[PDB]
């Protein structure tokens, strides 16, 4: 196709058309769309910034790994920035929009979709960009693996198993640290060469049956997916949250059925009980009584699953402290809410669960519930499935808090300390108030840290509110940095600002990242700007936000 | 000082003297030795290869981080190769010897020795190259932390905590994977700049009390040592087993007192019981009943702790199958021996321990022992301390199997499958026999993989056996690669050979590693040859073994 | 001389000795000191930071312009950084200390001292780095020019006329903006070539008498010092506050005797009268009734001229609001104090003076005084000489507020609005209080802006207070930048911080300045780091504060 709305930097319309005809000749016109449930792949959907920002020139869906290698070849020939996606469902981080306009979004999921291998004795699977969590689930159920191996799913199930893992997301089971469960990844580099990490570099020995296969299609050696380190430099991490390569395949470890499961809910009556609760959770997480990643939800998070804002009030301004208590009562929930789960034989569960209850009993008016003790529509019923690896679509109901809601995640990290968590909550709560927004968030409990997801929801068509959201977001980044907290992940417009936060010793961390990226991507064609890392041909003065 | 035995590549004697006076003027003459319990820092002690190989030109001991920076400056000025060590105690991997002769060994432990911080609520410590495991142990005992926080120690306690962790060593408690317990490292790069990884890049906010401190001496932000990922590319792994930078500081996560501990021994009668034992260990490790990294030791390993070869036989050739049985009997051990430990409240221990015993009960003649049930000198008494983080010097007795023994480790990885373990064991036992050596080894049980340490012991003054040792080693490397197994770590003379083994898709892995190294070390002065990775100014033709 | 405490970056001790013998052979040993009233030229005197910072390696005093050229030649040969000073008296901005250690301080005032020309019909003088204000004063008195031409002096008379003017200082007469009174500068560039700006580039026509003179010693054409622009790019400003060249000569415009002079003092009773006073000053300055640069001083500034802190109180903590009032009373001054002066025939003076008094009459309890109406020791008696171009040493008494006081200037710019002045004053007063220091300062009234000098005084030997001083300074810098105010000049340790504040559109300003500097100084030997501007061979990671 012929005339895009936006062309990549320095490229003519003629160059653009020559390229597209070349890609069209490789992957078929059906896998190449030019911009002149069903996630968009062309633009930021959770519009926060405006037009001209994050708009692709074309979407290209490779049929396979070779196609990715030919498309890289052509980006290097023509100097065309690529933006690689697996699914593009996470609006809030900007969905599939490219950081620089004119990029070709590389839809890896449309055709490279295969569950490559589910290995029972090793307790791992091997996956392509396109396998969503739902797909891996159906894959297990149709092969009888449901009662031998379990999954680990993020709050919504349509995300991509490999996508989520390379961006380092978190799940709610004992295997919740996705990135930490990977072993043996296949990558297409900026030069177009194929590379496999860890024991993935140790080739499967020759055998009659696997002779002549292209590299991509070759099997892996036996320890590829059982031991992540291989030998020498462990380079895997240069591929999480980076623009250093295009991830084509990845092995993720699966937790075998524990032969015992019980999910639960602990309600904390007062807004201020977060402090003692977090002090209670600390020793228990560090001492292993708490098996999975346990979450601490704010009342409106559960509230919004169950109903939009108009369904709880007419106010257009933020609900008050009073109303929040009334919503809590209405649903039988607390002001803050702890969800977690017990895994294993009954005899073990029991002891953990008597220790847990025992510890949270020191908070007045605390209340303990199993799924069964709660309403049909309850979050616990839904989360009962989430913490045993079963994927759902339920919790997506909160996105619709406001009418034409769009949301963004402000995601700082806090210590596992009541004092620290109350301090971080205060800073976010003031600012959310100052912007006219309800504060909505969760804390997901890591072993020695807490991931705090603040869900800023607003009206995608309101010029005034989007600017308040832009002002909120950048002010929270600074406030949080002035209190020694940093974000673990953000949307395309805050990458630069968040990377500037990690400036110890005059930006040593980013300088060093710059070196690695110009070395391996001399034309700077693999996602310029991802995480605020820019190749030399992209002037900081021109591109940073 | 004036005239070294060996000078670094292309450097004159005049250049060399100029440099050395410069370094002497920076760190004092007492910290600079020229080569013209108490580990050697000048040469490979476990002589395998011959003279001219792995011989330093000088040892240099920085007083602090500034001193490492100035020494890097002068290596880039003069083009002098540095070989950075922490302790240099691991003969068998080549102790502190440099891969290229003429290098200056950088002894980082002599002066940069401090336990920087032991934080209890966060359950981490922060350390300098010089803190040995014994040192961190005494640090805890002198501040009352012994009944709050425990360590994780490798079979010998004199190694370096950070050294062991960047090299990716393994311990025998639940926090056994050292590298995976790190968070927040300080690195001096080849350009001379200081760099802190993950949340170590997010600076501590300004305060009156920490103003004006040098970068090196600044505190870290609060999540520095609690969340390892930070934001963007996770680059940490580029510093493990690499020549990418000089590690100055590191934070390691400490496991709090579990309020319950029981160590144990399960003796396996027959040489062939390894196969069923490994099939039994598989589900139990994967289902979490086995809490620590359990070990499976061969009879001579325990034999050798207790006594030299002469003390069990006059024979000069390898002991036979029959004699091995007799030795087993003599000590009350099996042919293979499983060591492990139960952590936690009694109610929990008990259920794990009934599941463990139950499962190993299917192996005829199996026998279960607690420390107390065994002789004063037993290994289990020693290992009872090892599996609770208490360091010792006991197991070092085996190095003396033979008279003027030196040892080397042949270190392949196997599946956690009886079948695979028996196959690897066969390949290693034949080859050791063909070289006239006793087979001595362990398997340390990872979650989905086993680390197989074969301990090749020989006479360091015997020309004929050293060569058989070199022949064993390189044949094992190939044999193992022909069966799909790679090594996780080796001595200076096998580094090129083992890297060549990870050659999938025509050496992609090492090619990509060469790009990163030349980018960040344009003069190639940081440890040329580590892991088989060579900067461009070191001809492969000239330097590879 | 042989062995300095600190050597410039990358330079050997042998190189250093070679250079120094070369310079010694050019200017004589009496003009070259090696570091192994009477201002120091070797280190920061108003110690704030610590050792190793801002320490010269040698002081070099050229005999003349040729000598500066040869010294530039040798800095480019050896790559040695030069730090050019004129006088070095301004402790508080760091006196003559170099921004990078190992630099050679180039003392230009010791020998290049001459009053080159005082031209009456043109009403200008032409000067070398060494002419201090006292010196130009005595020059005028010895040639009868005292009743024809007047000077313009900064609060202390010992600074350098050209030095003060390239740094853009301010005086208290109608010709108060020093930099704006220059015309025709002679510069030695980093390549070593001599350059004369504006009509200084248009050469004096040949004549018998000026044939054969070196460039440096040639006369200037007739408009050289009467029209500053010349033709084409006006480049003059590249030499103010910059590291673009070494200023050798400069022409400054002198204001002829106005035939009428009356200096005065307007005392403002209350701490809050600053607000109405600044609103009163606004129209009057803008409408030209206020002839000179009037000043508005805080009570302790005048207090401190007259006596140390101990002489007003025993207190070690900051004096209170109440005590300030009592001090005001004791001296017959207000809380704030406005100094100014009427120039010109009596008929004109009188009308300005009735308009001035009239306007300030709306501030209750206001009091008007001429010199004669005040005590012998009063500030107005001193400032009566200051506002007619007569230099003094009097006001230097305040430096001794505290015992072993050192001071630093925090120098922001504010609008000429009572509201803005009170807001800036608040921000600075809180912070000084939080550091335990007395707030001391002035506002010097530009035509449409105010220069606010906050004088931070502290004990140069107190580790704890120096750090509070470093904390104050950097917090003030940010606070002020968060309120839209920038600093106009700072000490060596805040240069990077203050430049980072002028970062509109991702640091465009400094990026563009980096381009000009690398173009003209390819070896980066002219004052690396001045104003936060660093040549390419000075890693930002390594050198920024
Ligand atoms: N296969 C891949 N290779 C490299 N980067 C990838 C790959 N897949 C995803 N990414 C990255 O992950 C980011 C998140 O996108 P995505 O895969 O669409 O999320 P999700 O599956 O959580 O909806 C993309 O912006 C891109 O940076
Ligand atoms: N601080 C460090 N920075 C970089 N590499 C290091 C550092 N310390 C040790 N090493 C690496 O670790 C290897 C193992 O050495 P060493 O510390 O002496 O072992 P141990 O502590 O097991 O005795 C060295 O050869 C080098 O590869
Ligand atoms: N001739 C000159 N050429 C270039 N820069 C100069 C020259 N003289 C002074 N400077 C600059 O002016 C700054 C102020 O120094 P100085 O002359 O010692 O101050 P003062 O006269 O106020 O005591 C120096 O640090 C340097 O930045």
Closest atom of ligand 2 to B90 CA is 23
Tokens of B91: 């003969």
Distance separating alpha carbons of residues B117 and B125, to the nearest angstrom: 5
Q: Helical H runs in B362-494?
A: 379-386, 418-434, 463-482
DSSP C149: E
Q: DSSP 3-state assignment of C290?
A: coil
Find, among A168, A181, A49, A31, the residue nearest to A104 by Cα: A31
Tokens for B130?
């010089």
Strands C405-410, B413-414: parallel, antiparallel or unpaired by DSSP? unpaired
Tokens of B291: 């809490």
* Cβ-proximal residues to C289 (8 Å cutoff; 6+ apart), any chain: C352, C355, C356
How far apart are the C-alpha atoms of C70 and C83, rounded to whole Å? 15
Query: CA A532, A537, A538: angle at the middle one, nearest 5?
Result: 40
- Using alpha carbons, select from C266, C227, C225 the residue that is nearest to residue C249: C225
C184: left (phi over 0), alpha (psi -120 to 50) or beta: left
Least Cα distance to C341 among C320, C371, C375, C300 occurs for: C371
Strands C336-343 and C295-298: antiparallel
Give the Cα-Cα-Cα angle B207, B209, B212 (nearest 5 degrees): 85
Identify which of B306, B298, B295, B301 has the alpha carbon closest to the alpha carbon of residue B271. Answer: B298
The whole-angstrom separation of Cα C295 and Cα C278 is 11
Q: Is A163 in the pocket of ligand 1 (CB under 6 A)?
A: yes
Q: Residue A205 burial by CB count (10 A; 0-12/13-18/19+): exposed, middle or buried?
A: middle
Instruction: Tell me A205's DSSP state.
Output: P
Q: Closest Cα to atom 24, ligand 3: which residue?
A: C85
DSSP one-letter code for A389: T
Pair A125, A178: CB distance under 8 Å: no
CA distances from A342 to A291, B441, C70, C359 (A): 7, 38, 81, 80
- Beta bridge partner(s), residue A412: A487
Task: Report helix angle B346-360 to A346-360, nearest 10.
Answer: 170
Q: Where are the beta strands (DSSP E) in C230-326?
A: 245-253, 255-256, 261-268, 295-298
> A243 CA to middle of ligand 1, Å?
11
Is the shortest distance between the CB of A87 and ligand 1 below 6 Å? yes
CA-nearest of A80, A71, A65, A103 to A185 is A65
B122 and A415 in contact by Cβ < 8 A?
yes
Instruction: Using alpha carbons, select from A206, C519, C112 the residue that is nearest to residue B483.
Output: A206
Mutational pocket test of ligand 2: of B163, B396, B488, the residue with most ligand atoms within 8 Å of the beta carbon: B163
The 3-state DSSP class for residue B231 equals coil
Expressed in angstroms, the distance from the first to the final Cα of chain B is 31
What is the rounded CA–CA span in Å between residue B406 and residue A529?
52
Q: Do the beta carbons of residue B469 and residue B413 sit within 8 Å?
A: no
Closest approach of C512 to chain A, Cα-based (Å) = 10
Residues 6 or more apart from C283 whose CB is under 8 A from it?
Answer: none
Q: Chain B residues with CB inside 8 Å of C36's CB?
A: none
Length in residues, chain B: 545
Helix axes B274-286, B346-360, angle to 10 degrees: 150
Minimum CA distance residue for ligand 3 atom 18: C88
Q: How many CB atoms are closer than 10 A to CB A127?
A: 27
Ligand 2 centre from B104 Cα, in Å? 14
Q: Among B292, B235, B281, B262, which residue's Cα sits nearest to residue B416?
A: B281
The atom of ligand 3 lying closest to the CA of C167 is 12
Measured CA to CA, the distance from residue A169 to residue A411 in angstroms comes to: 12
- The DSSP-derived string for A275-313 is HHHHHHHHHHHHTTSS-S--EEEEHHHHHHHH--STTT-
Ligand 1 centroid, distance to A62 Cα (angstroms) = 15
Answer whether C158 contacts ligand 3 (Cβ < 6 A).
no
Nearest CA to ligand 2 atom 24: B85
The pairing of beta strand C124-127 with beta strand C115-119: antiparallel
SS3 B540: helix
Which of the listed residues A40, A85, A532 should we mutate to test ligand 1's pocket, taking the one with most ligand atoms within 8 A of CB?
A85
Whether residue C438 has its Cβ less than 6 Å from ligand 3: no
d(CA B82, CA C438): 53
User: To what resolution in angstroms was this structure determined?
Assistant: 2.6
- Residue whose tokens read 């440096």: C216
**How many Å apart are CA B86 and CA B92, to the nearest integer?**
16
Nearest CA to ligand 2 atom 11: B85
Report the separation in Å between the CA atom of C168 and the middle of ligand 3, taken as the mean of its atom positions: 10
Instruction: Give the containing element (helix H, strand E) for C326.
Output: helix C321-331
- Phi-psi domain of C223 (left: phi exceeds 0; alpha: psi -120 through 50; beta: other): alpha
Q: How far is CA B179 from the centre of its chain?
A: 11
Q: Phi and psi dihedrals of C277, rounded to 5?
A: -55, -50
Cα distance between residue B295 and residue B290, in whole Å: 11
C10: chain B residues, CB-CB within 8 Å:
73, 77
Beta carbons of B481 and A202 less than 8 Å apart: yes
Beta bridge partners of B228: none
User: What's the token pair of residue A427?
Assistant: 């800073």
Distance from C-alpha of C68 to C-alpha of C193, rounded to nearest angstrom: 10
Please give the method by which this entry was determined: X-ray
Where do the domains of chain A lie, and which CATH numbers do they carry? 1-113 (3.30.43.10), 114-136+150-200+220-256 (3.30.465.10), 261-491 (3.40.462.10), 492-544 (1.10.45.10)
Cα of A216 from ligand 1 centre, angstroms: 20
CB atoms under 10 Å from CB of A423, counted, come to 15
Mutate to test the pocket of ligand 3, among C61, C85, C250 (most ligand atoms within 8 A of CB): C85
Place of tokens 């062991």: B164
* Burial class for B364, CB neighbours closer than 10 Å (0-12, 13-18, 19+): exposed
Whether B212 and C475 lie within 8 Å, measured CB to CB: no
**And the tokens for B307?**
């006594």
Nearest to A92 by CA among A372, A406, A363: A406
For residue C203, give Cα distances in angstroms to C3, C192, C196, C210: 45, 20, 10, 12
The CB of C84 under 6 Å from ligand 3? The reply is yes
Residues with Cβ < 8 Å from A51, sequence gap 6 or more? Answer: none
Pocket test for ligand 1, best of A84, A94, A527 (most atoms within 8 A of CB): A84
| Under 8 Å between Cβ of C99 and C492 | yes
In angstroms, what is the span from residue A522 Cα to ligand 1's centroid?
Answer: 22
Phi first, then psi: what are they for A387, rounded to 5°? -85, 5
Q: How far apart are CA A395 and CA C464, in angstroms?
A: 54
Residues of A in contact with B358 (CB under 8 A): none
Q: How far apart are CA C412 and CA C452, in angstroms?
A: 5
Give the integer Cα–Cα distance in Å for C23 and C57.
14
Chain C: give the shortest CA distance to residue A457, in Å: 27
**Cα dihedral angle (A244, A246, A247, A249), rounded to 10 degrees?**
-140
How many cross-chain Cβ pairs, A to C, lie less than 8 Å apart? 18
Q: Is C86 in the pocket of ligand 3 (CB under 6 A)?
A: yes
Tokens in use for C192? 């070593």
Triad C323, C329, C334: Cα angle to 5°: 95
Chain C residues near residue B211 by CB distance under 8 angstroms? 467, 470-471, 474
Query: Which neighbouring-strand residues pair with A29?
Result: none
Closest C-alpha among A132, A126, A134, A87 to residue A107: A87
Distance (Å) of CA C521 to CA A395, B22, C81, C533: 61, 29, 11, 12
Distance CA C240, CA C184 (A): 13
Show which residues of C are catalytic: 93, 488-489
| Neighbors of chain C by Cβ distance (3+ pairs < 8 Å) | A, B
Structure tokens at B55: 């011989």
CA B480 to CA A322: how far, in whole Å?
69
CB atoms within 10 A of CB A22: 15
Q: How far is B321 from chain A (nearest CA, A)?
A: 31
Nearest to A422 by CA among A286, A288, A296, A302: A296
Contact call for B191 and C539, based on CB within 8 A: yes
B246 Cβ below 6 A of ligand 2: yes
CA of C101 to the centre of ligand 3 (A): 17
A312 an active-site residue?
A: no
Q: Cα(A371)–Cα(A380) distance, rounded to whole angstroms?
A: 6
Q: Which residue from A225, A207, A203, A189 is spatially nearest to B504, judged by alpha carbons?
A: A203
Measure the CA–CA gap between B10 and B18, rounded to whole angstroms: 15
For residue C167 and ligand 3, the question of a CB distance below 6 A is answered with yes
CB C83 within 8 A of CB C61: no
* Closest CA relative to residue B85, chosen from B101, B96, B72, B69: B96
Distance from C-alpha of C447 to C-alpha of C293, rounded to nearest angstrom: 8
How far from C332 is each of B11, C122, C166, C310, C375, CA to CA, in Å? 77, 43, 38, 20, 9
The one catalytic residue among A53, A89, A93, A133 = A93
From the list B53, B89, B93, B349, the catalytic residue is B93
Closest residue in chain A to residue B213, using alpha carbons only: A505
Give strand pairing partners of A85.
A107
* Inter-chain CB proximity B211 and C13 less than 8 Å: no
**Residues A111, A240 contacting (CB under 8 angstroms):** no
Instruction: State phi, psi for A278 to the nearest 5 degrees.
Output: -65, -30
Cβ contacts of residue B471 below 8 Å, gap of 6+?
B435
């Amino acid at each position: 196709e012929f005339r895009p709305l936006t062309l990549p930097p320095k490229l003519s319309l003629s160059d653009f058309n020559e390229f597209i005809q070349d890609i069209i000749r490789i992957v078929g016109s059906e896998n190449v769309e030019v911009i002149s449930m069903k996630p968009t792949h062309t633009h930021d959907p959770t519009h926060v910034m405006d037009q001209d920002y994050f708009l692709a020139s074309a979407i290209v869906a490779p049929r396979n790994v070779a196609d990715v290698q030919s498309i890289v070849g052509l980006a290097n020939k023509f100097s065309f920035p690529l933006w690689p996606i697996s699914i593009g469902r996470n609006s809030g981080y900007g969905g599939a929009a490219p950081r620089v306009s004119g990029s070709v979004v590389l839809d890896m999921g449309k055709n490279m979709n295969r569950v490559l291998e589910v290995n029972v004795e090793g307790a791992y699977c091997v996956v392509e960009p396109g396998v969503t969590y739902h797909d891996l689930h159906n894959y297990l159920e149709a092969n009888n693996l449901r009662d031998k191996l379990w999954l680990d799913v993020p709050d919504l199930g349509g995300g991509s198993v490999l996508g989520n893992a390379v961006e380092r997301g978190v799940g709610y089971t004992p295997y919740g640290d996705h990135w930490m469960m990977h072993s043996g990844m296949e990558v297409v580099l900026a030069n177009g060469e194929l590379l496999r990490t860890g024991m993935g570099a140790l080739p499967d020995p020759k055998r009659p049956e696997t002779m002549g296969l292209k590299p991509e299609d070759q099997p892996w050696s036996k320890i590829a997916h059982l031991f992540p380190y291989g030998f020498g430099p462990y380079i895997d991490g240069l591929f999480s949250q980076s623009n250093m390569g295009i991830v084509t395949k990845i092995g993720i470890w699966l937790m075998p059925n524990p032969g015992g499961y019980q999910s639960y809910l602990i309600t904390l009556p007062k807004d201020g009980d977060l402090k003692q609760a977090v002090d209670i959770i600390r020793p228990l997480r560090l001492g292993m009584a708490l098996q999975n990643v346990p979450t601490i939800r704010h009342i409106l998070l559960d509230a919004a699953v169950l109903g939009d804002k108009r369904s709880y009030s007419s106010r257009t301004e933020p609900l008050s402290d009073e109303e929040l208590d009334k919503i809590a009562k209405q649903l039988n929930l607390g002001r803050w809410n702890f969800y977690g789960a017990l895994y294993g034989p009954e005899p073990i569960r029991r002891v953990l669960w008597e220790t847990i209850k025992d510890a949270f009993s020191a908070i007045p008016g605390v209340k303990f519930y199993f799924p069964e003790d709660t309403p049909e529509n309850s979050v616990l019923r839904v989360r009962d499935k989430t913490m045993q690896g079963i994927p759902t679509y339920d919790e997506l109901k909160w996105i619709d808090w406001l009418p034409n809601g769009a949301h963004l995640f402000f995601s700082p990290i806090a210590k596992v300390s009541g004092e620290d968590a109350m301090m971080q909550y205060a800073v976010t709560k003031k600012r959310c108030q100052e912007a006219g927004l309800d504060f909505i968030g969760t804390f997901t409990v890591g072993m020695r840290e807490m991931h705090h997801i603040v869900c800023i929801v607003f009206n995608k068509k309101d010029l005034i509110q989007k600017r308040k959201v832009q002002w909120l977001m950048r002010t929270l980044i600074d406030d949080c940095a002035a209190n020694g907290w940093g974000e673990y992940r953000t949307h395309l417009a805050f990458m630069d600002q968040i990377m500037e936060t990690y400036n110890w010793n005059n930006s040593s961390f980013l300088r060093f990242n710059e070196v690695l990226k110009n070395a391996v991507d001399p034309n700077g064609i693999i996602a310029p700007g991802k995480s605020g890392v820019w190749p030399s041909q992209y002037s900081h003065v021109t591109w940073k936000l």
